[PDB]
Structure formats: structure tokens, C-alpha cells
Design a protein around this ligand. Structure first.
Ligand SMILES: COc1cccc2c1C(=O)c1c(O)c3c(c(O)c1C2=O)C[C@@](O)(C(=O)CO)C[C@@H]3O[C@H]1C[C@H](N)[C@H](O)[C@H](C)O1
Lengths: 228, 120, 208, 456, 122
């Protein structure tokens, strides 16, 4: 038994998209398909469920009237069509399987649950064209706890959409390096930071290189971070 | 809104002691309470903290295990059981009340402190 | 529904218990799911007392009064994830706020560092000033910005990293964005951090 | 005016009532097998239902083939010959022995046929067991059919009734013994119905042989004394006279099987109502098929006397009695269209759909008496081949297309199974027109070619 | 749904007894054979017991000596008595009925049920 999802990618707000969930390894007429949405940094939320046919079908109140769920039993697929999207629907969608007559069986002593899930497809709604990052130094100074330990960083700003990956000395430094999660700015672009707590003895008199990779722009940004 | 420490004084090495904090004017049911210590001619460092019921207690690395903290909302009193006392622990202990609901750290009111000295 | 212990600082080999409070007189047993940090969630308990085939015998369910509790007898280093409770209301499935477990550890005071905007950013026209806190364990902390002793708000944004696998610590950073004119108008920029491991809040300041 | 019409009608109500009783006994013999295996399981009921659905069309071929033997012995006995009847009867017995072989082979290929209809393995093995049990019954059934053709031809329809009834009432205990393993017999189960039907058919054959030997009524013919040797010339002659009236009886059943195939896409609550209505119409058809056989006997006898006008009068009174009984049974269907639909099923949707279809079934029953009595009437005239031409070109060419056009298509809002039934009406009508106009030409042809063709 | 209505279920302590019933309408039920199928989450639908038109019992492998199926014909019901229930028996039980739709049909028809939950625990 296995579930596989499809669709996702980038959509302009007010557009539309279609997600397909294909199930293999059981009888599609004995179970029902549920869609569960997880926003970045938030909890699980229920979107819509469909039984084998359109006789049984339900949607959450928060997305009632926008989304629409249908099922094709011939190829064992469930399609969720989303239209008139808004900026708060960018999330990861999971496909889950449950009992067919779950509402009839629901009671104080019974709750079947959802057994098998999918990998989940990412759908993001945005209003910015793909752009490369803007690396910037975050070097320490003579008053950054010099003589003991010091911290040196590499900032990345205004990139979209692929996760901008970072490395130090082309992968030759991994002791005490932190890369904070991306933060969605008010302009629609993302920001990110990396830091290292390297020793403060002239930073070892070694050159420090922050290497930045952004796949859609295929740009191997290289920034020599030096003490001001 | 007053905090008063009690218990401590002079004690032999390897002994046992119990400190208590009395709080007046406020209810410690909704807040958290912590204990700090300051050695003479030194700084003030963290010792222990006890959060609301069902959240657990957290201790510092230096005094882990030998120290335990408990709360009593009926008496509005926090208790600190200290065992295996050492001369290095000779210091003035100050209680503090974290009034922030989300435990972000307030320590808005402290106590007058109590000197605990260890010497054979 | 109401998963009250939204954070649990549990150690290894200890018994843990979390509770889901159905905030309505609606009859539906709670099903308990587990989600690892990043992957799809798995089903643990159904009907508030049964045991899904495959999960270890440690997980147990109960329903005391009108709430539903889940217990773990021993906490191996594998059961460190987030847990959700599912209920049904007529025809709508409702999950919970969420409950995340946390590795207990001695409290550490964060070290604070301040980075002013670099001269390379000035040519663009917008300057970002950042302050980071490193090696602390509670997960809570307060970061505030003061420009010429004026408390700013609505202009800063902060992020925090996941727990490490070498000392189970944390780190966070807050960035403040200002246009060139506003940056040049002011004189002194300071970032203050308050924490439970700190006797008094610690401020890092710099003058341009 | 009446004149001779009342006299011929009374002589036709008798000699046809015993045939009706024999036919109801024959159908009850299979009904008992189905309704008595349903007391063991549902698998055993569906198995002995599918096996019967495959067994009826196969044996109907030989049963129709011997209806050529019927008017042959009718004509001789009418003229006064009564001394070449034994030779014809013996040759017909050998013909039944020969025609049993292809039917036995076809039934031996049952396991292949039940693969092309999605039958699970348990139902398949039970069906194969039933078929391999009734294969032994096949030759006895064909020999009994030939023997009853001899007795019927001499206008003696009483014995086959009694031996028929004794068969039915002997299927009840023999089934019980074998299905439930009583009295030391093996516990065959649902298969035991077939092994009891075989025994009852052999018993009926033995009883009918006994009656012919002693009788004291047929003792003058002395059928089983000479034992005439086989003659291929006559054997071919008596096969060319019976094959056309077997092809038609095969093609009618195949037509209804095909219509069952075509109405399947319309749903599953429509096919159930369709088969309920068709099953009831099958018994209401048992009603006028008995009149047709008696009319064939009477016109064969009267052509033997060289009484052309008498043959015509017998045919006409048969065609009137068929219509009258058809009207009576059509009104009772229209009135009690709900009680009959409630005996079959308990699904109220099915009883509503079948209550609507049993309104077209009434017109169907009214037309399928003018068809059948007319077909039997000219069969006595030895006009076998004509039937096969006019019946076929009116059934397959008309009903199946106009059923599809007025049904699942709209080349004329597509109607449901009430379109297939309308096509059935359209076919049965004009079947009862071609078969009704051939008779009128025959009844008014030269007064000599009638007798000459009556010997053909 | 409509043809078959299951009744029974609830919270049964381990070692307890339960009696499920199944009411049939729109079915001849004198020639249709019946059965009960469990389906727990994670597993697949499986048979528990089945009775034919003649009352022949065909209990499953790990059901012997614990479940007894009975049937009534005056009032169309199929009873399933469960004894010595263990925590492995928690599932939703479905009443399945297969048999001829009418006396004129040849292929049998099958009707399922909505199902009744059965949870066994303290
Ligand atoms: C004189 O010919 C016969 C002589 C002896 C037995 C038989 C027949 C005979 O003709 C016959 C049938 O024609 C039919 C059947 C049948 O058993 C026999 C004989 O046994 C079965 C049938 O009704 C089914 O498909 C259901 O099983 C189909 C068919 O009836 C079709 C065509 C009929 N004209 C009638 O309209 C009926 C309603 O449907």
C-alpha cells in the first residue's frame, strides 16, 4: 500500500492549481481520502475529505467555497482543485487514507484515524520573480570578545525561491557553524544567515570564505569575509 | 509584593540544608521562581529554577544533582534542598520571581538574600 | 484540541504524559498521531485506548474524566517528535495545537554578538543590523532594540535554529532593517537580551 | 353459427389440457431442483440455475427435432395406414439416439462456457458436477420425447401427463435422499439434484415403455414386435423434416440470451426487473404452446382423412382459442401485476420496475399466442422450413435492431428496457403476420397440393 | 446502508461477551447466506464467520470456540455472539449478505453493511 502526490510549485496569488494523489495496493472503494495542509512553522490542519463517490464529501470551513475535491476510481486518484488562492495557502499538502463511513462510525468510543500518508507536495503562492541572493559580510571587530572567542557571519538577502545553500571554506569548516532557517520578508524575498564561532586569535590568520549556491541562478557566490 | 529568604547560615561540609522563600502581596501560582547565588566580591550566577506545575525544574551545570527545588502555592513558598555542601558554595542566595507568563524572564522582584557558609 | 503541555523537557528513560482536552461536549474519541521534524506524520493510538500495529508497547492511551491522556513508559532517544490529537465534530476533523518534546539539559546563558551593517550594503540603500545569541537552553529569550534609548517595534525580525545533536543547545538572531536616511539620522544602536539564565538583561551597543 | 366450430373447440380443449399439465410438470421439475438446492446454500442454488440455463437450449434442439415425428405418425394414423407407424417410430428412436451425441458433447464442454461469464471456482465445480450428472439423463429424455411423440400422434395425450406428474412428485423424495444423504445414499449435496433428475427421467422412460407394450389401446399397432432394421435413406428424410423446427427453437432462446447481454449495461436493478417479467411471460407462454401442439395433431389427423376443410376449421378454432386464453391471461397480469412481482422479489424498486414492464408483457402475451398457434398449425401441414424463414427474419432482423434503436440509442430520449420490450412487441407482431399470411395461402391452395405437401 | 442494518458494539472489557445483530430488509433472506467481516486500522478486511441457507457454520481459524453465529427466519436477523473477547478483536464489523436477488435470476447479488464499531479495552 502506497500513496504518491503530485503538483505544487509556484503560483501567483489569485491563480489556480491542481493536486493529484494516486493510491496503489488496495481497494479504492473501501476507504476515503483526506487532504491535510501544513503551513511552514505551523501545525497540521484539515482541508477536505472525499469517499469513493461524490455522495460523501466535506470541506473545512476555512476553505469552503474555494477548493473542490473529486475522485477518479478508474485510475485510483483523488484530485484537489484549488482556485482563488491567497498568500496564506503556501504550505505542504499530505494525502491520507481513512475509513469510508468515518462519520457514521464516529462515536465516543471509536475513532479509526488516518493510517497511511504521502510524502506531501509543496505549493507556494508568491508575487516575485525568481532572483539571486545578495551576500553580505558580518565580520567581528576589535571589541567582539577579542582575545577569547569571536563570532563571524555571512548574510544572504533577497533571494527566491530555491533554498540558498551555504558553506565555509568550500566545506572545510563545520565546527560551530549555524545556518538559521529562511525568513520570509515583507517584500516577498527571503533572508538567511550563517555564523561561526571561530577563535579570536587574529581568527587564526586564515582567510575565511563564505560560498553561496542558488540553483535557479546557478550562482556560486563567493565572499571573502574579513575583519573590519 | 515582598520577598524574604529564610534558612541557611553556617553549616559543616557535606551537610544538608533547606532554604525557603516567603512572598507577600502576590500569588506564585501563575508565575515561576528561581534561585541565584552571589559569592562575596563576585558576580551573581544562576543556580536553579522551578516553573509552574507540570513544567519541571531546571538546574545549572555546576550545582546539578546536589540541589533540588520545590514549590508550594498553598503557602506561597519555594523550598530548596541542598546536599553535599562545599566551602565553594559560601555565598548569599537570592530568590527571584519570573512574572512573565511565557517564562521569557522577568525577575522583577528579588529577596534580601541569605548567607550560606561552609567551613569545617 | 487543547493540548496543554505544548512543550515537554523530558529526559532519557523517563515516563512522560501529555493531555488533550476536548473543548466541547462532542462525543468523539481522540486519535493520537506522531510527526517527526520534517517527514509525514504517523498514527500511534486510535479510539483513545487501542494500539496501532507496529508501534512499541511503551505508548499507552487513557481517558480520565473528559480529557484524553497519552503516556510513554520509557523514553528511548527515538520518541523525540511532535504529537497531535484528532477529534471529529459532526463532519469536520480537528487536530490539536501540538505537543513537542525536548531534551532536558542544564540551563546555559547565551553569548550575544552584534554586527552593524557593512559598507557594501550602504550603496544599495538599505542597512540591516543584526544581533545573535548563542549557546542557551531554555528555548525562551527576549530580544529588544533601542536606538538612542528609543524602543523600536515592527521593524525587527528574529529566527531561531533547531536543537543541536552535540550539546542540545540553541541559537537565534534578530535583524533590524532601516533605510539609509533613518540610519544616518540616529547615533547609537543597541540590542538587549533577557533570559532566565541571566541575572540582569545584557545589552550590546555601538555608535556609528 | 357455430356449426362445427364448437365441436372442434371442445375436442381441442381436451387433448390440450393434458399437454398443459405435462408442460407444467416439466417446468416444475427444474423449479424444484432450484428451490430445493436453495435449502442447502446459495452457491448450490446459483450453480443449479446456471447449469439449467446452459441445459435448456441444448436439449430444446432435439425436443424440437422430434416434433417432426409427431405429425408424421399423426398423418398415418388419420388415414388408416396404422401399419407403417412402427417402422417410423423405431427409426425415430434411432434418430434420438444419434442426436443425443452432439448435445452430450456440447454439455461436456460446459467448463469452457462458464469461464466466459465470470463464475467463481466453487460455483464452477458445482455446475460442472450438475452437468456431468444430467449427461446420463440426456438419452433417456430424448427417447421419452420420441415415445411421447408416438403416443401424442395417435391423439393420446393422457399418459405423458400421468408419467409427467409421477415424475415431478418423485423428484421431491429422490432429491431429498441425495442432497441430504439419507437412506444410505451419498451426501452429494446440491449436485444430488442432477443425479435425481437423471433417475426420474430413466424411470419415466421405463414407465412409458411399459404403457405402450400392454396399453390394450395401442395394442393394434404392435410397435415393439418387428424391430425394423435401420435405413439411412429414411433417417436422412426424417432429419430434413425436423431440422428447420429445431433451428427456430434454438434461435428464439439465443435471441433472448443476446437481449440479456445487451440490456446489462442499463444497470443491475433493470436487468432484475427484465428477467422477472421474462420469467413470468415464459409460463404464460406455456399456456398457448399447448394449444398449438394439439392443433398440429388435429390438422395432421384431418389431412390424413383427406379432409382439407376440416383441417382448416381445426386451425382456425385453435387460432381463436389461443387469442381468447391470451386475453384472459393478459387481463389477469394487468390486474395482479403487483402481487406477481412480489412473489419473485422483495426489492420494492425492482417490483416497481417489473410492475411497469409487466404492462408491456401483457401485449407480449397477446401476440405470442397468435404466433405460436399459427406456427403449430402449419407445422401439421409439414411446412417446417417456412417457419424457420419467417420466424428468423422477423425475430433477428426486426426485434434486435428496433430494440437497440428504441432502447439504448436515440436515432428515432432513449428509452430503457421498456424499449427492448417494445422491440419484442414489434418482432412478435409481423411474426404473427408472416406466419399468419403463410397459413392463409396454404389453406386456399389447389385442394391437392395441400395434401401432397401434407405428405412432404 | 438500507438493505442491512447492523446493531451492537460499544466498550467491552477483555473477557466480556457481546451480541451483534444484523437486520435485513429488501432481501429474501431465506435463500441468501450471511457473514461477518472485521476490519481493523492498518490491516485488511477479513472474514470472521459465515452461515449458509442450511445453517452450516464456517467460523474463521482464530475464531473457533469463541464466536457463535445464529440466524432467524421468522424475523430476518443474523446474530453473532462473541465470548472471551480479547484486545485484538477491536474493529468495525460488517454484515455481508450474498444470494439471488429474485427467484428468476441466475447470478447472485451481494450487499454489504454500514458496519458497527467494537472497541475492547479497560
Ligand atoms: C414450442 O417450443 C417448445 C417446446 C417444448 C419446450 C419448450 C419450447 C419453447 O419454445 C421454449 C422457449 O421458446 C423458451 C424457453 C423454453 O424453456 C422453451 C421450452 O421449454 C425459455 C425462455 O423463456 C428463457 O429464456 C427463460 O429460461 C426463452 C424461450 O421463451 C421465449 C420465447 C417464447 N415464445 C415466449 O415468448 C417466452 C416468453 O420467451
Amino acid at each position: 500500500v502506497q500513496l504518491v502526490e503530485s503538483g505544487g510549485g509556484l503560483v501567483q496569488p489569485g491563480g489556480s492549481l491542481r493536486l493529484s494523489c494516486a493510491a496503489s495496493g488496495f481497494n479504492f472503494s473501501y476507504y476515503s481520502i483526506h487532504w491535510v495542509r501544513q503551513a511552514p512553522g505551523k501545525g497540521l490542519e484539515w482541508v477536505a475529505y472525499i469517499s469513493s463517490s461524490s455522495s460523501y464529501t466535506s470541506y473545512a470551513d476555512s476553505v469552503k467555497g474555494r477548493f473542490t475535491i473529486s475522485a477518479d476510481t478508474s485510475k485510483n486518484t483523488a484530485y484537489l482543485q484549488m482556485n482563488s488562492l491567497r498568500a496564506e495557502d503556501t504550505a505542504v499538502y499530505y494525502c491520507a487514507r481513512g475509513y469510508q463511513y468515518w462519520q457514521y462510525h464516529a462515536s465516543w468510543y471509536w475513532n479509526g484515524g488516518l493510517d497511511y500518508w504521502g510524502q506531501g507536495t509543496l505549493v507556494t503562492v508568491s508575487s516575485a520573480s525568481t532572483k539571486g541572493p545578495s551576500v553580505f559580510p558580518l565580520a567581528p571587530s576589535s571589541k567582539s570578545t577579542s582575545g577569547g572567542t569571536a563570532a563571524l557571519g555571512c548574510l544572504v538577502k533577497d533571494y527566491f525561491p530555491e533554498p540558498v545553500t551555504v558553506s565555509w571554506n568550500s566545506g572545510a569548516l563545520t565546527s560551530g557553524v549555524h545556518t538559521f532557517p529562511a525568513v520570509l520578508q515583507s517584500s516577498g524575498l527571503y533572508s538567511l544567515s550563517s555564523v561561526v564561532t571561530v577563535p579570536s586569535s587574529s581568527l587564526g590568520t586564515q582567510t575565511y570564505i563564505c560560498n553561496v549556491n542558488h540553483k535557479p541562478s546557478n550562482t556560486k557566490v563567493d565572499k571573502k569575509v574579513e575583519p573590519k | 509584593v515582598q520577598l524574604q529568604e529564610s534558612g541557611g547560615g553556617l553549616v559543616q561540609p557535606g551537610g544538608s540544608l533547606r532554604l525557603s522563600c516567603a512572598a507577600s502581596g502576590r500569588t506564585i501560582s501563575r508565575y515561576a521562581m528561581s534561585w541565584f547565588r552571589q559569592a562575596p566580591g563576585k558576580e551573581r550566577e544562576f543556580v536553579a529554577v522551578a516553573r509552574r506545575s507540570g513544567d519541571g525544574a531546571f538546574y545549572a551545570d555546576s550545582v546539578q544533582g546536589r540541589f533540588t527545588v520545590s514549590r508550594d502555592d498553598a503557602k506561597n513558598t519555594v523550598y530548596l534542598q541542598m546536599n553535599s555542601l562545599k566551602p565553594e558554595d559560601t555565598a548569599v542566595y537570592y530568590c527571584a520571581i519570573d512574572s512573565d507568563t511565557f517564562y521569557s524572564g522577568s525577575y522583577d522582584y528579588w529577596g534580601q538574600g541569605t548567607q550560606v557558609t561552609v567551613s569545617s | 484540541m487543547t493540548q496543554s503541555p505544548s512543550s515537554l523537557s523530558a529526559s532519557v528513560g523517563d515516563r512522560v504524559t501529555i493531555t488533550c482536552r476536548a473543548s466541547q461536549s462532542v462525543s468523539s474519541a481522540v486519535a493520537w498521531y506522531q510527526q517527526k521534524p520534517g517527514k509525514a506524520p504517523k498514527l500511534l493510538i486510535y479510539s483513545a485506548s487501542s494500539l496501532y500495529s507496529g508501534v512499541p508497547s511503551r505508548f499507552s492511551g487513557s481517558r480520565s474524566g473528559t480529557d484524553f491522556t497519552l503516556t510513554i513508559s520509557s523514553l528511548q532517544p527515538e520518541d523525540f517528535a511532535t504529537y497531535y490529537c484528532q477529534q471529529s465534530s459532526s463532519s469536520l476533523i480537528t487536530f490539536g495545537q501540538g505537543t513537542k518534546v525536548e531534551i532536558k539539559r542544564t540551563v546555559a546563558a547565551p553569548s550575544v554578538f552584534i554586527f552593524p551593517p557593512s559598507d557594501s550594503q550602504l550603496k544599495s540603500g538599505t542597512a540591516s543590523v543584526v544581533c545573535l545569541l548563542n549557546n542557551f537552553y531554555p528555548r525562551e529569550a527576549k530580544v529588544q532594540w533601542k536606538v538612542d534609548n528609543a524602543l523600536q517595534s515592527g521593524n525587527s525580525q528574529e529566527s531561531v535554529t533547531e536543537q543541536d545533536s552535540k550539546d542540545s543547545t540553541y541559537s537565534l538572531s534578530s535583524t533590524l532593517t532601516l533605510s539609509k536616511a533613518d540610519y544616518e539620522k540616529h547615533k547609537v544602536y543597541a540590542c538587549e537580551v533577557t533570559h532566565q539564565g541571566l541575572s540582569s538583561p545584557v545589552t550590546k551597543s555601538f555608535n556609528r | 353459427s357455430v356449426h362445427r366450430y364448437k365441436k372442434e373447440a371442445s375436442n381441442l380443449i381436451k387433448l390440450a389440457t393434458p399437454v398443459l399439465i405435462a408442460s407444467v410438470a416439466q417446468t416444475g421439475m427444474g423449479f424444484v431442483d432450484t428451490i430445493m438446492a436453495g435449502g442447502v446454500s446459495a452457491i448450490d442454488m446459483a450453480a443449479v440455475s446456471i447449469a439449467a440455463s446452459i441445459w435448456l437450449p441444448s436439449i430444446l434442439f432435439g425436443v424440437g427435432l422430434l416434433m417432426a415425428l409427431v405429425p408424421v405418425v399423426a398423418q398415418l394414423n388419420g388415414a388408416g395406414r396404422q401399419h407403417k407407424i412402427p417402422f417410423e417410430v423405431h427409426q425415430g428412436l434411432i434418430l434420438a439416439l444419434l442426436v443425443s451425441v452432439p448435445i452430450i458433447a456440447v454439455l461436456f464442454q460446459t467448463q469452457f462456457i462458464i469461464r466466459f461469464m465470470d463464475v467463481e471456482e466453487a460455483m464452477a465445480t458445482k455446475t460442472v458436477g450438475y452437468m456431468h450428472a444430467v449427461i446420463f439423463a440426456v438419452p433417456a429424455y430424448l427417447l421419452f420425447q420420441a415415445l411421447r411423440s408416438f403416443t401424442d400422434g395417435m391423439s393420446l395425450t393422457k399418459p405423458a401427463m400421468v408419467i409427467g406428474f409421477i415424475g415431478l412428485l418423485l423428484n421431491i423424495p429422490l432429491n431429498w435422499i441425495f442432497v441430504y444423504g439419507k437412506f444410505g445414499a451419498p451426501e452429494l449435496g446440491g449436485v444430488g439434484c442432477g443425479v435425481a433428475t437423471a433417475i426420474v427421467y430413466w424411470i419415466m422412460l421405463l414407465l412409458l415403455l411399459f404403457y405402450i407394450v400392454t396399453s390394450k389401446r395401442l395394442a393394434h399397432v404392435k410397435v415393439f414386435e418387428t424391430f425394423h432394421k435401420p435405413q439411412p435413406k429414411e433417417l436422412i428424410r426424417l432429419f430434413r423434416l425436423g431440422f428447420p423446427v429445431a433451428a427456430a427453437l434454438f434461435f428464439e432462446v439465443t435471441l433472448f440470451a443476446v437481449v440479456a447481454l445487451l440490456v446489462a449495461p442499463l444497470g443491475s436493478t433493470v436487468v432484475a426487473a427484465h428477467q422477472v417479467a421474462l420469467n413470468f411471460s415464459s409460463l404464460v407462454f406455456m399456456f398457448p404452446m399447448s394449444i398449438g401442439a394439439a392443433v398440429s395433431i388435429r390438422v395432421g389427423h384431418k389431412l390424413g382423412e383427406q379432409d382439407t376443410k376440416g383441417a382448416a376449421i381445426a386451425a382456425n378454432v385453435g387460432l381463436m382459442t389461443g387469442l381468447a386464453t391470451a386475453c384472459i391471461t393478459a387481463l389477469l397480469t394487468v390486474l395482479f401485476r403487483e402481487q406477481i412481482a412480489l412473489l419473485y422479489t422483495e426489492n420494492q424498486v425492482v417490483v416497481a420496475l417489473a410492475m411497469q414492464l409487466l404492462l408491456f408483457a401483457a401485449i407480449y402475451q397477446c401476440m405470442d399466442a397468435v404466433q405460436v398457434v399459427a406456427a403449430g398449425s402449419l407445422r401439421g401441414y409439414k411446412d417446417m422450413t417456412a417457419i424457420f424463414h419467417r420466424t428468423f427474419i422477423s425475430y433477428w432482423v426486426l426485434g434486435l435492431p428496433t430494440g437497440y434503436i428504441l432502447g439504448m440509442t436515440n436515432w428515432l430520449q432513449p428509452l430503457g428496457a421498456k424499449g427492448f420490450w417494445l422491440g419484442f412487441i414489434i418482432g412478435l407482431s409481423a411474426a404473427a403476420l408472416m406466419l399468419g399470411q403463410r397459413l392463409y395461402w396454404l389453406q386456399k391452395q389447389s385442394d391437392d397440393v395441400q395434401l401432397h405437401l401434407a405428405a412432404k | 446502508q438500507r438493505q442491512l442494518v447492523e446493531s451492537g458494539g460499544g466498550l467491552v472489557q477483555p473477557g466480556g461477551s457481546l451480541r451483534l445483530s444484523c437486520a435485513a430488509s429488501g432481501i429474501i433472506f431465506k435463500i441468501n447466506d450471511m457473514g461477518w467481516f472485521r476490519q481493523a486500522p492498518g490491516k485488511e478486511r477479513e472474514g470472521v464467520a459465515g452461515i449458509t441457507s442450511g445453517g452450516r457454520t464456517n467460523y474463521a481459524d482464530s475464531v473457533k470456540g469463541r464466536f457463535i453465529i445464529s440466524r432467524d427466519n421468522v424475523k430476518n436477523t443474523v446474530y453473532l455472539q462473541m465470548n472471551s473477547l480479547e484486545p485484538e478483536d477491536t474493529a468495525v464489523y460488517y454484515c455481508k449478505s450474498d444470494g439471488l436477488i429474485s427467484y428468476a435470476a441466475s447470478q447472485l447479488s451481494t450487499y454489504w453493511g454500514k458496519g458497527t464499531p467494537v472497541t475492547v479495552s479497560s
